[model samples]
Target: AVADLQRLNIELARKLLEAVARLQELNIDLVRKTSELTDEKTIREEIRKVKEESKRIVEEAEEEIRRAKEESRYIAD
Candidate 1:
């Protein structure tokens, strides 16, 4: 049982890292798209929105990682 749970934790951690990478790619794409826009106002707005969304996603990911760590500790115990 412990091994199975540890395996799951490892998988989740890997997936979470993938998600963070994707998030960075998404930010890059957003920046590229915004670069095409000439309107400064809209550019700032869009960037802000994207940043807020990224912040929220990062927070959630961190929480999930913490939960996974706790599970790993439990298994070790």
Candidate 2:
């Protein structure tokens, strides 16, 4: 039972990494689109969203680290 939970945690940690990567990929397109944008309101909104995404990415990374550490329990022995 505990190993099952451990596996789920590790899977979630991995998916978080993928989520961050996907966001980075989206950000590249956002950057290009932002370059084409020349309006104040929309630019500020995009910047705000960037900051929010940055915050979430870091938080998720911390979570991944925690889970990865916990994952060692199943293999450490």
Candidate 3:
């Protein structure tokens, strides 16, 4: 039986695009943070933002893993 590969492909493409955008955002952040340290900034606020961003990235990756697993778990031998 033929599966609806087109649907799967589109879903993967969407996920890939989102992941690419995320990587670009992260890239900018890493570069900016590495060069600039501000003693004037409030440490508490900065730390909380960091914690939330980390959680968001982890959650997105988890969804990607779950989607891929569901699509491939019972493929033809």
lDDT of 2: 0.77
Model 2, 1-77: lDDT tens per residue? Answer: 57777777778767887877878876886797689899979988888887788778778777776867776665665
In candidate 1, list every pair of residues with a backbone clash.
none
**Model 3 over residues 1-77: C-alpha lDDT tens digits?**
14665666678778777876876786577556645756536544555565587668768967886877677655533
Give me the runs in candidate 3 sitting further than 4 Å from their true place: 1-3, 38-66, 72-77
Q: Please identify model 2 stretches exceeding 4 Å from their true place.
A: 1-20, 74-77
- Evaluated against the true structure, the overall lDDT of model 1 is 0.82
Measured by TM-score, the strongest candidate is 1
Pitting candidate 2 against candidate 3, the one with the higher lDDT is 2
- Tell me the tens digit of each residue's lDDT in model 1 across 37-66: 999899888888888888887888888878
Order the candidates by lDDT, highest first: 1, 2, 3
Worst 10 residues of 1 by lDDT: 1-10
